[PDB]
Design a binder for this molecule. Sequence first.
Ligand code: FAD
Ligand code: LMT
Ligand code: H2S
Ligand code: H2S
Length: 418
Amino acid sequence: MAHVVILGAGTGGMPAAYEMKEALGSGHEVTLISANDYFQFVPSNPWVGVGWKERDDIAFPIRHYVERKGIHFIAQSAEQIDAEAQNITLADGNTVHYDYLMIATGPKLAFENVPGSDPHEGPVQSICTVDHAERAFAEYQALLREPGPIVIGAMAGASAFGPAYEYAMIVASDLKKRGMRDKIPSFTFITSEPYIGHLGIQGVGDSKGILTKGLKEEGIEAYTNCKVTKVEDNKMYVTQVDEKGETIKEMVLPVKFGMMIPAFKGVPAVAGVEGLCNPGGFVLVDEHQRSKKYANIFAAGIAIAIPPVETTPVPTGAPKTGYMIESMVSAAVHNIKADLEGRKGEQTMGTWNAVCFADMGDRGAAFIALPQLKPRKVDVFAYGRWVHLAKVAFEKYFIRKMKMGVSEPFYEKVLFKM
Ligand SMILES: Cc1cc2nc3c(=O)[nH]c(=O)nc-3n(C[C@H](O)[C@H](O)[C@H](O)COP(=O)(O)OP(=O)(O)OC[C@H]3O[C@@H](n4cnc5c(N)ncnc54)[C@H](O)[C@@H]3O)c2cc1C
Ligand SMILES: CCCCCCCCCCCCO[C@@H]1O[C@H](CO)[C@H](O[C@H]2O[C@@H](CO)[C@H](O)[C@H](O)[C@H]2O)[C@@H](O)[C@H]1O
Ligand SMILES: [S]
Ligand SMILES: [S]
């Protein structure tokens, strides 16, 4: 009977495919469609960007692992979605009909917001994708051959601030390990955050003080409330505002090596569905992950819309992170299954939370924050070896699971208790 399509094979989409097939069984067709033929473990990208990891450590071909599970895989980008006819048009012009569609397309990296900021058009690189992280590293090596000013940070509208700090810190660390640090004219951190360690979540534990001291310790000069208007002639044009939005300065910073986390928007094939998304291209869903306009469209991951709780001097967004994403996936699968069986599924993603782990080498920083608005129930920022062991363990676990299959509540990791 019912044909369920999962669009996008990333952090939410890959497990979604397995969980979907596992829940529906042999009487239903599950098809996974994605723009790339390989899965990549995104949290490892910053390390790739500094050459501490290789593509081969963090990426692998999808086909065999999902097909052996009875899942169909189309390594093709969706270009157009007709929600009325329920047809997806692929890059190669073929079309795929669906009865249920689960959108897990992740972020469009919106380099267009800042002219000249695209990794291919200037010195400002990116570590959001393994492709980009490889490019970043390559440029980093050029920096090593001809030392120059470094600029790392997060654009206006960014939501993934952790990766910016992680990358700045591991770059400094790598520079030192190479006895190359003191050869750098200047190393500067530019962020749209209202203050250091805001992280798009109004700060967590002592994120402010600890990240502030960390940057200072590494001789990284830091500026907040910044937006970049353009990257041009290897200069970054920065405007810094006050709490009221008024300009308080403009800077022109030269860049030999740069990495700025861009704003995320929804991908075009999805943003292009009339009435499906908010103006940023994010899918508007109810608490059950069901599209508010189309009863047979669900969504999970960065792709869904989550309303802001704060309005910062420079536009910033709140991060969507792995544990909450899996919780969205789990609800979507349950609720589609319920549709395929009469009921309206009642499962939700649960309490909003942000969880992030960043490895520095032998130790790391991690935070856990919930719910979204303060006063919170848990508001922890921690640094230690346990964080490094956690991150290493989790990468290994997730990757193995993406090869072996996922049947169950993803975090039996909480069995290290029992
Ligand atoms: C650098 C970085 C580090 C991060 N580190 C952490 C971390 O340590 N911990 C944590 O919890 N979270 C982290 N996150 C955030 C979040 O967990 C990841 O961004 C996660 O990969 C998001 O999952 P997703 O499924 O929504 O999107 P993605 O993993 O990006 O997957 C989207 C998929 O859809 C595909 N796709 C897009 N458009 C189309 C289309 N039109 N047709 C077909 N396929 C398409 C893409 O190719 C991709 O496979 C990090 C994010 C970044 C950018
Ligand atoms: C992961 C979410 C956020 C992403 C940001 C990633 C960047 C993290 C880099 C910040 C590192 C800060 O740098 C570090 O601060 C901590 C905590 O105060 C250290 O360590 C300090 O606290 C504890 C444990 O928490 C130690 O065991 C220690 O002996 C003590 O000195 C400092 O010695 C300093 O080196
Ligand atoms: S995000
Ligand atoms: S993160």
